[PDB]
Design a protein around this ligand. Sequence first.
Ligand SMILES: [Co+2]
Length: 105
Amino acid sequence: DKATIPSESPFAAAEVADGAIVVDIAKMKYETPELHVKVGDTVTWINREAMPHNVHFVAGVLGEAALKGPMMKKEQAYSLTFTEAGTYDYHCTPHPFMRGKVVVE
Ligand SMILES: [Co+2]
């Protein structure tokens, strides 16, 4: 497994940690679709819109099993800590046309 999860469930946008690396979700898109971070960094998605969304990494990306994140409602957030270098593609489960990637160096 190449990621650890600070919080299995979503939490309010206001509760996002100081210093967070943030990807907003708005207008049916990941607003930073190509994010560059370092091994060990935590990325936090924040959903800005009324339509709930998640992040979903297919099997073979963060590990052997898919990682289907929980749905973030409006003004909710979710974090993943990347523990290995690589380019990690993801999508929103019911909106697979929404795609993004985290490049971990
Ligand atoms: Co969605």
